[PDB]
Amino acid sequence: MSQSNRELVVDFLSYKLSQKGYSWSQFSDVGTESEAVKQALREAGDEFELRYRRAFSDLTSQLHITPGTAYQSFEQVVNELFRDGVNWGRIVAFFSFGGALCVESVDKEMQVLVSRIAAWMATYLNDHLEPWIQENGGWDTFVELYG
């Protein structure tokens, strides 16, 4: 499910970037069921962020993202997020976190980071979350659970 997982990351980040007025195409040169999955994840991300906006700018601000330090900051936080297991809420939180890091990157004129974060997120999804996702019925489970 590897290429589908990259498309999911790109769709979600493109959406979050557009909510802040930013255009994916400037940072990167990158059926029915994929559309349902993308839409459920955009909506869950919106709902997660609804009651965590200006204070989850705070967290990302506290990490002091820079091109030299972003990878370890991203990976250490994600490793702790999933250290004792996976559930759909944590996966939504993972997407939202990586979205917040991309927005912060563009705000700080560190646009090179957008395509890197997307790569790191797709790699993590495919290497460390896809086994759990598949044993929990695939992304269609998420579409049903969210609605």
Partner: protein, 162 residues
Amino acid sequence: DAKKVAKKAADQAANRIRELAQVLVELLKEALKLDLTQEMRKKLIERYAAAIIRAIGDINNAIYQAKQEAEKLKKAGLVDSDQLDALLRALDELQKVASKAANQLGRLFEEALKRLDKDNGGEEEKDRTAKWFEFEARAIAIALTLAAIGDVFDLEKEWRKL
């Protein structure tokens, strides 16, 4: 049934906040260590951020499962439309109060860290700021547990009214 749906959701969400409060107090104590390398300070911030994000992801996980159980009960005809409405509003209220508690705990941790850094002084001022943070975090955790019991209790009495 419906009563177990609401109870489970409330208990999970309140327990995630109690756990977050505990993690943050422990991280603030580590930040009090006085041969703390930067190497560690960066890891403390990362653990802070992950604890906040974990707590809110887990709160949301409990709420989404509970709303799916609520709709299954509507379909199986174990709840009518007005009872389902009361349950969904209670779950939205639970998500709102637990997500507020998580943001408040994060903000109080960030203020504590700053008082530890900027407000410079003997351990006394600084260890005061630690015990203040722990006092405030416990108050938030207690208040949330009390609201969780009370809101489910009142939901049940609302269902009886209906």
